[PDB]
Design a protein around this ligand. Sequence first.
Ligand code: ZN
Lengths: 98, 1061, 49, 40, 49
Amino acid sequence: EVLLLPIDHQPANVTTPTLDFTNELTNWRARVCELMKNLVDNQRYQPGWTQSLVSSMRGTLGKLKLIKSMTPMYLQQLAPVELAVIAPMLPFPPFQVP
Amino acid sequence: GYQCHVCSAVLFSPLDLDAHVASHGLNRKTAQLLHADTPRLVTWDAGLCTSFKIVPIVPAQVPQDVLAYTFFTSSYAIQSPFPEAAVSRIVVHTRWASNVDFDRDSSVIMAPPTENNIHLFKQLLNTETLSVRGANPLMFRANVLHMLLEFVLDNLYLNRHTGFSQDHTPFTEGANLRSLPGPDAEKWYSIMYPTRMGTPNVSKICNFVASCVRNRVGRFDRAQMMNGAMSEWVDVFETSDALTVSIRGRWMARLARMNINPTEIEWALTECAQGYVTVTSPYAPSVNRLMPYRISNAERQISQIIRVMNIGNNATVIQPVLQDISVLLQRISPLQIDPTIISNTMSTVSESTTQTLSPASSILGKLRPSNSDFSSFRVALAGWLYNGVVTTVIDDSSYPKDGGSVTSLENLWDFFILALALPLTTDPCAPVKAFMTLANMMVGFETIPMDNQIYTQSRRASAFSTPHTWPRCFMNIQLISPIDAPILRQWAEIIHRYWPNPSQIRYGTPNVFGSANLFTPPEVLLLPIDHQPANVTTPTLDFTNELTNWRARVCELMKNLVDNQRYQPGWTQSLVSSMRGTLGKLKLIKSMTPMYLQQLAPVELAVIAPMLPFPPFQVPYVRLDRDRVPTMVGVTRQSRDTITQPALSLSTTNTTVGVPLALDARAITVALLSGKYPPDLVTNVWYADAIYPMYADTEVFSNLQRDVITCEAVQTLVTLVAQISETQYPVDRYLDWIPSLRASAATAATFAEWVNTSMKTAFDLSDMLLEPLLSGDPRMTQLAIQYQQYNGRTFNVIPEMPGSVIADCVQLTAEVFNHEYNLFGIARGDIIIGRVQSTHLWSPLAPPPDLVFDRDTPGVHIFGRDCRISFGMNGAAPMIRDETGMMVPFEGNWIFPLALWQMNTRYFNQQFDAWIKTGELRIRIEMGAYPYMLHYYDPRQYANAWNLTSAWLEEITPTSIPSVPFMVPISSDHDISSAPAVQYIISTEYNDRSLFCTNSSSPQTIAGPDKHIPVERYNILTNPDAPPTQIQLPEVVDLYNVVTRYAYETPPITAVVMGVP
Amino acid sequence: VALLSGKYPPDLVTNVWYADAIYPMYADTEVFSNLQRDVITCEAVQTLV
Amino acid sequence: VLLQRISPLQIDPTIISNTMSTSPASSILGKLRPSNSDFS
Amino acid sequence: EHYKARPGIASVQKATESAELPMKNNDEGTPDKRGNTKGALVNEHVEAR
Ligand SMILES: [Zn+2]
């Protein structure tokens, strides 16, 4: 009686905030956006850009870091519940490797 | 085009003909950033300020036989202050007695409780409810909050003074009675004045009025300041209620805080003109104007942060603002460009025809003196106000192709065009580009050590745009060796020595206006170049400022370059003579543009800068210090998971704001080298004529009116969201007893949009407000701004939130609703669906305490989340599972939660409804709040509640319930018979508060539920020891108060303050 | 893009939504036939070997 | 298909467009293509 | 018929009808009653492509 998942799951409530960094997918999105901000920040690694695109690039990364989206909220709370509901009724029951 | 009519001459192409006649003769953000909408603050109300009316329900028996018809005052057509009826309720209709000039499209209109009021509670989040009579009991809290917000945003008016009489009749002797306008007024003088009617009767209304006091009627105070003018404010005793008197009083105080007199408008506009335009104000006793225009600096800072968040990058929102400021500088600036100056001064340059270069003639093909220098020079001057957002840089195309070489004469002039234009930009990396253009001109000729192989010497000078790319050989001048790089050593010394200095000019009038700038102190601007004040008013030519020094030293470097032994023998001697003569010619070219920019343009900037739709936004102009170059600026609108403190959750939650902008270095160079004055001008007459006509505008005041609505709407939003979801700000919660759902992100994002629409409609706004606050998560909102230097030193600004009277009044109406829940069609508590058959006449909204029970009552089974029902085989009774593991038959007293019935409504109907009707069991279904509907039966006949209660129990849905029906007996006066009545749904607590008076014209009420006219409301009449200006606000509403009535007037500012031309 | 966007309905209660999504799914169950076929699949193997 | 029919998650790509409100900013709106609704 | 299904019975059941469907048979490579291995004549990797 176990169903192996490559994601961490938490008990389900709908009132959790969208911008928690305890959620590891939201943490992953935030760390990738911070790494790309450090990559753009000081104009080396991009010679030949004639204009200064660092402010605009940093702003459009900040928006993608701080976007509201309930998909990382969904995948750790309600997606494993639906998988556990669906799975014993399947015609070919699940075959997993760790 | 056929023919002109001066001479009979025929032509074609009317583009020729109009010249021939002249010869005879001679989206959304762009709109809101310039022409934002104007809110309607001041609104007058000539009617009486009430929101609670008294509607009759069932008619009294006026032709009755126990008592003769001559007893009744209805038989004489006597107007009464209260509607005569057997049963009369009080309901809620905002502005049933009002007369306004501009309506707010938001009102709370209730039907009397015999009809259905479910359409006020199914309004907000019920889009998946099937029935047209059902509503979800999980959205009652959001529905009630939206109703209270509608209720306040309606009542935000001002009371208006109309006129008075003197009562010739002996009713209420000598009183001055108000006369409100409209189609009629005869029906109003009984409603306004309950104490005016005579008292002949022992009817209940005449028991009340004969008990009342007499001297409190009509007008009793005034402020008569002048003979033959309006009284300013009066105090009238009349019908009102304390809640809307309180709302309009706090709104009047909120507007009276903003008031300014005609003198301070003069004192503000004189300082804003800085002495050039003088306006006047009268010196006389006047009549009490109302001009709401003074706001605190915190509101200006918050409205600045929201505009900067609108001009998150987008590259096109702020371009029309710079276009507008360039066109505005056109109408003021006495400096005119004269392209013939350069064509004059390059004529008389001595050169040979036999040479093949012509240095005096290559530079005219470089410059190409044309007309569009102005709209590229004044944009560069307008960009000095917006260092924080716009970073104007020289165009990509204005640099040479391959970097060029100094042997190239055309690239030698293309360096000179850039060397003059680069000090006027506002990017902080201008001097490194000014150095690197010459270091690209010299590759192979002479070399200097760079940092890496990536950003070497031969890189294009446009790419050095950040402080990290500033080379060590430039930041430390000793690395350029003067043995094998003397010209680059000299140009580096010229950049480090003669680069211009920043300064400060002091615009602004912080008394009437508010200083909307952050990151700087108030009343100060920052300039890239140094300025002096004008000493003389007859200006004339001189050569002493930083721009003329900068023009001289570049030419002297180029002369030292052509005086190089490594460079000179490549050229012929007459060509060297002509180039040196052209440089000595071009040193001392007469142009008024440098002296203009030094000592007479910052006066124009400081004069213009308040009169501006988007107020300025600057970060400090640092000259050459790499340590303090601003690398970002960022605003926030929300917080992280835990941190309720903006000073901690600011650095990790921001959006970087700021966009570059391109400029034409050739046009800036032409505008710098060619500028002249009018031939005999005086620089105070010119400005007293030019600045005068634009100081009769009101947009600079209406934006100050707009920022109030912008700052108060976000405070109302953060107050109202905190009721349905958890937040970080400390608020009170009075409506936890109303059941609510569990708020997700989409619930708060929907509710916030409905709040936005209810503000935007009520204040007459057609554009968009608080939308960037809606783009993010609206639960945890904060507003802050910061900028960061190179070394990581961050300077943050967190503006405080001033209080909003809209949210204050919404919380006040919530506090009143906690005691007056019965008026808005809601009962508190829960219901019991037992069977009670008796001939008694008790009302089900006030049941006797024999019938009710609770969790504390012993012998009462409690059902929770578990329902297992065993069927009854072989005559045995079916059983249901208790919470504590017991199996009980269908008897006794039960307690359900409402959701337990909702999840299993059809399975419970077929099991339980046959036992509730004819058997015995009681079910206390608990929900907290529910709307109620009434049915009045005649107590002399048979009645039965099953066709109502079964119709209620069948229609319970897992997503909706309909309103709850009750059966109230009609209280007759005289002796009646007795008949059996069968009641099913009773209440738990008292819910009979909306009842006003029973039978209202009879002496008493023998049989039925009775109450007299509530003395506890009419406190001012019935209590002689009470002061007249007393309200008892959270407990009662009091229905009759003293109210102030103003007679102010609101003229435009140009109708009071006039300026001399 | 499915990670970066996506939202819930603004009125959901999970005890309504999942109690309404589970029931027609379990109404078309076939587990009692699959468990009744797996015995035959297991029983053919002995009669093969 | 069955996860899409059971799941409460309504994937609409318009949140990205409302957040951007349009260069590097328009380039990601070119790369993501929020005019598409194929989420198989 | 007061309550309507919030995910929808007609929408959930039409997907459960095709989740109910059994796995497709794979027959090729196995002999028939006579003894011939049924299937097509092809390189096995070309067939798996
Ligand atoms: Zn002519």
